[PDB]
Amino acid sequence: SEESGLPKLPVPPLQQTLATYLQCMRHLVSEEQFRKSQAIVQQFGAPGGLGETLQQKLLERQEKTANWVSEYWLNDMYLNNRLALPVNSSPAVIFARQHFPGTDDQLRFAASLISGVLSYKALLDSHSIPTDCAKGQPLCMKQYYGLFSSYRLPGHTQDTLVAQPEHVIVACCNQFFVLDVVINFRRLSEGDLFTQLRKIVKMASNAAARLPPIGLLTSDGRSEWAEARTVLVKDSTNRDSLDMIERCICLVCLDAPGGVELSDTHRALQLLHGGGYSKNGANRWYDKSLQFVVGRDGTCGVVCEHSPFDGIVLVQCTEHLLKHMTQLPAPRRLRWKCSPEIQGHLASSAEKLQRIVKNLDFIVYKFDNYGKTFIKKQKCSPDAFIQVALQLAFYRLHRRLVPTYESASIRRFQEGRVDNIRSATPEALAFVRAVTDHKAAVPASEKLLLLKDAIRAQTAYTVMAITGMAIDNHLLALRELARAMCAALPEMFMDETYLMSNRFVLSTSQVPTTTEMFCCYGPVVPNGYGACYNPQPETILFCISSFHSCAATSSSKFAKAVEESLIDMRDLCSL
């Protein structure tokens, strides 16, 4: 009735989590460090010890909350992160290339897309989204209600995720306009929206009314933007304008032509960071959860602030919008009252964003030799096969495995977001060593046994994670319950093995789509990669990111290593 009928997130047994943790990490640390971690974990998990006390506190939390990890996970994964949102945090979804002969063709697309957003939001708010089922077991639908009603406020040390006549904000030439999408309570038609967008484009070209590019401030580090926003709110005009953005449905960004070839890689860059201030980088407001981009040259997609929802729900929404597209007072410019103080903040923010633009090493690589159909003919799940290929790619290029992240949905449970699948398994290590160590001369028949055992272990970890039995959320909650007892964390969580374990040098996810769109994001540590893939029946799309500052990583070398690994795995499956 009022209460969810879904199960609550399970609390795994303490000794199960501690044993999985040590087994996860043994091959990723030195023998001496492992020996010390074994003793730390034994003391933490001893009968009558601290771990048992924290586990009892966690079972009490599970009883008193809908979801015992929600608050800790939201803060740990998103709100505590100080990095600027572009590239480091906010993923982008790139739509098919569009062809816009005239400005009017760009605006008709934007009007059609806005109409689709209004229609989808009406379905959402009437609770008419058919409940998703696993692969079926019903799934939590609460992420859908965060697509349009969320705003991420910056804080000095921790951000705040806020839930809220309806309006969109249109960004054009770094200027922001309120576009009301109802008049006389009747939703604006696609034709009315077109008429309004034309007025906006005319107003935005006016030099005598041009305001400073305040959106650039949202692209900065979170504490930097917290400081600049605090300067802004000293003025009531700015407060009014910030309130309008905080309460909009979404942004629609009418970007300027990019001036570069519209390859998939280049369209993805424009969606990730707008190409910086000199291009479209200030035509943005990164705190708002959805920024649809409809560029004059046909580059279209959506930039996502992903603190309120994960990738499956986002793609369900965007696929619905795109498929739906197949079937009067003037807008109000938001005013700003700036100072030389704010001008200094703008210059700083432009410089910092340019460092992100220049630092990103990004490639879209389409593997075209095979995809899901071939993989399923090997009695393998496509996801597990591709995760083992990524381990082999990393090992053959960098000669070690590293802590690897892969999102696993826990939407089977109330308020469920994700837990981590740790794909750098002991079985993956045995396989990649056998493949790469030519001196060992392991027979191909044995390499194939090791391959299938690595895929089996990957599949098992995935089942463990999606059923709430993996370890990362459990350890996070024990850690934060310990911090509530005493600000000095116990040795368990100060141990260098634990800190290492959560620096995801390879950060991955599978985002399958049914249309030509694709998803991408940056790495999460300076010496890391981001790898987001889209498996299709006969192809697999890989979006690979890394940072040019890190001499070890290279996105083009990693994409080549992925190709070589998929070909090696094909050859082993063809003996």
Ligand SMILES: CN1C=CC(CCc2cccc3ccccc23)C=C1
């Ligand atoms: C480093 N990283 C970053 C993200 C994920 C998974 C979540 C996600 C992936 C791709 C698109 C998304 C669009 C909207 C919301 C979440 C999205 C995994 C690793």
Ligand code: NA
């Ligand atoms: Na996790």
Ligand code: NA
């Ligand atoms: Na690099």
